[PDB]
């Protein structure tokens, strides 16, 4: 008994191709180039899952030291002034606090200075 490859290769291929959306060129229309894009695509996806965390952390920091600086301190001094006191252990989300509620974050700064010198 024979067994053509009928319908199989079409579906596989279509699954691949349907992945290609904002895909410029023949990346989105010719199978091979599509699949091939999908390799390096893998690479980027997987690494970016890990990377996005680095990114965000950086973001939050970049805000936090700004807040710090708005009063007369910095990020080093500020976080450190929450380490000396087991009191404040926010760390995460702090950026949102310096971005939305200024007064609160002022209070935190004042606390940091008070738990240092």
């Amino acid at each position: 008994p024979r067994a053509k490859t009928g319908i199989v290769r079409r579906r596989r291929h279509k699954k691949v191709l349907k992945r290609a959306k904002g895909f410029w060129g023949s990346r989105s229309k010719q199978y091979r180039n599509a699949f091939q894009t999908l390799l390096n695509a893998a690479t980027y996806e997987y690494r970016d899952r890990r990377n996005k965390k680095r990114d965000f952390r950086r973001l939050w920091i970049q805000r936090i030291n700004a807040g710090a600086r708005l009063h007369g301190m910095n990020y080093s001094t500020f976080i450190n002034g929450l380490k000396r006191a087991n009191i404040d252990l926010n760390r995460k989300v702090l950026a949102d606090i310096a971005a939305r509620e200024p007064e609160a974050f002022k209070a935190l700064v004042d606390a940091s200075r008070n738990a240092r010198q």
Partner: protein, 94 residues
């Protein structure tokens, strides 16, 4: 966050890690670290005076994400399905 959503929140149902106890309306007590309840800023430790009460809404199953790996020139292509489970909790505390 890591677990247990503190902070000041006005009755909102959020989604975090699972909470073991399956069911519904299971009282969930959480410690605070900051909040603006009545425009009164309160730091950590002292916040222990106030605690958040939350009820479980539903045990939803995460969003479907395909995990793909690839190393060029060596073959190695990996494809496996994944969804991390959770639960929704309705914040309603002090």
């Amino acid at each position: 966050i890591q677990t247990g959503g503190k902070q000041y929140r006005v009755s909102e149902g959020d989604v975090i890690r699972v909470e073991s106890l399956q069911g519904e309306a299971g009282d969930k007590v959480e410690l605070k670290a900051l909040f603006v309840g009545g425009e009164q800023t309160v730091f950590g430790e002292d916040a222990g005076k106030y605690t958040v009460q939350a009820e479980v809404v539903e045990h939803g199953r995460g969003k479907k994400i395909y995990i793909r790996k690839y190393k060029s020139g060596v073959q190695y292509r990996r494809r496996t399905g994944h969804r991390q489970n959770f639960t929704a909790i309705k914040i309603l505390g002090i």
